Amino acid sequence: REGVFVSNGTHWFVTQRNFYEPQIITTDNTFVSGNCDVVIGIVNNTVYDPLQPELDS
Amino acid sequence: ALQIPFAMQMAYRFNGIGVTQNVLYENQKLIANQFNSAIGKIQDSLSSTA
Numbered sequence: 001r002e003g004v005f006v007s008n009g010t011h012w013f014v015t016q017r018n019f020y021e022p023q024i025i026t027t028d029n030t031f032v033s034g035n036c037d038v039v040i041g042i043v044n045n046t047v048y049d050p051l052q053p054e055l056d057s
Numbered sequence: 058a059l060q061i062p063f064a065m066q067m068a069y070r071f072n073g074i075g076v077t078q079n080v081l082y083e084n085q086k087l088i089a090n091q092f093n094s095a096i097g098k099i100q101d102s103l104s105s106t107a
């Protein structure tokens with residue numbers, strides 16, 4: 001939504017463009033648009049849902 | 058100077074005029090071909106007209 005995906009080697013974070021403040025990638029950091037066959041350079045990672053744990057407990 | 062992949066730089070340039078990023082990524086080849094042909098047209102215009 002605002003920022004850029006980065007990786008310190010192992011885990012994928014989403015930061016703001018002008019200052020390294022990494023954040024877990026969740027569905028509120030990111031927005032869905034399209035699918036995986038059209039983008040060039042798309043990677044595989046896990047997007048955390050802030051809602052699923054609440055439903056679970 | 059902070060390096061950044063040119064496709065992502067163009068994504069920022071698109072997101073700066075009110076067009077989301079996915080527009081570029083889903084239309085990256087189209088935009089690249091349009092830019093290349095535009096530069097070719099610039100060459101033709103400068104070479105034909107003084």
Ligand SMILES: *[C@@H]1O[C@H](CO)[C@@H](O[C@@H]2O[C@H](CO)[C@@H](O)[C@H](O)[C@H]2NC(C)=O)[C@H](O)[C@H]1NC(C)=O
Pocket residue numbers: 008009010011
């Ligand atoms: C990249 O950063 C992540 C976390 O920001 C590092 O993973 C953590 O490593 C510590 C140390 O063992 C663990 O206690 C955490 O549980 C890890 N977090 C996760 C989510 O796995 C990771 O080691 C860093 N990678 C490099 C190459 O430095």
Ligand SMILES: *[C@@H]1O[C@H](CO)[C@@H](O[C@@H]2O[C@H](CO)[C@@H](O)[C@H](O)[C@H]2NC(C)=O)[C@H](O)[C@H]1NC(C)=O
Pocket residue numbers: 043044
């Ligand atoms: C990222 O995940 C996708 C699936 O979500 C992987 O796509 C697989 O690609 C292989 C190689 O062509 C196919 O045999 C599989 O059938 C694909 N999976 C599906 C569900 O269709 C893709 O390979 C993954 N990429 C990386 C780098 O791990």
Ligand SMILES: *[C@@H]1O[C@H](CO)[C@@H](O)[C@H](O)[C@H]1NC(C)=O
Pocket residue numbers: 040041042
């Ligand atoms: C980046 O370029 C390398 C070649 O140097 C290529 O193997 C790789 O697929 C490219 N990745 C992207 C996302 O363009």
